[PDB]
């Protein structure tokens, strides 16, 4: 890749070409009504199905 | 009021000319393109490093 990470590999036993993708990562945001109002929150997981 | 027809006609003709100038070719929207480029140049150096 352009940032010098390997993205494709060849299997050393069966000679099959494999693509490599990252495991899921992202940011987490916490949405709150206010501590004085309530103790509940909602969670937003960013950039994920 | 005494010249309303002429004013209406040249208003419509001016809108038609603006539409043609946007249709054929436009560097007039360069400023919105210039904003787009310096962001993409900013990230390409971040991945390069
Ligand atoms: C390597 O061994 C596996 C099973 O042990 C076999 O399926 C594969 O064909 C072998 N590869 C080569 C290049 O001999
Ligand atoms: C998320 O994944 C599920 C199961 O793989 C799929 O049914 C759904 O359409 C996906 N949503 C997207 C890609 O927006």
Swiss-Prot record, chain A:
Q: What does this protein do?
A: Attaches the virion to the cell membrane by interacting with host receptor, initiating the infection. Binding to human ACE2 and CLEC4M/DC-SIGNR receptors and internalization of the virus into the endosomes of the host cell induces conformational changes in the S glycoprotein. Proteolysis by cathepsin CTSL may unmask the fusion peptide of S2 and activate membrane fusion within endosomes.
Glycosites = 36, 49
Q: Which organism is it from?
A: Severe acute respiratory syndrome coronavirus
Name the record gives this protein = Spike protein S1
What stretch of the parent protein is included here? 554 to 602 of 1255
Taxonomy, top ranks, is: Viruses, Riboviria, Orthornavirae, Pisuviricota, Pisoniviricetes
């Amino acid at each position: 890749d352009v940032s010098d990470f390997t993205d494709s590999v060849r299997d050393p036993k069966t000679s099959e070409i494999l693509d490599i993708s990252p495991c899921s990562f992202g940011g987490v945001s916490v949405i709150t009504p206010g501590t004085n109002a309530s103790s509940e929150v909602a969670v937003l997981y960013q950039d994920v199905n | 009021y005494e010249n309303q027809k002429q004013i209406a006609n040249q208003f419509n003709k001016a809108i038609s000319q603006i539409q043609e100038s946007l249709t054929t070719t436009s560097t007039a929207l360069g400023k919105l393109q210039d904003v787009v480029n310096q962001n993409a140049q900013a990230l390409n150096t971040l991945v390069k490093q």
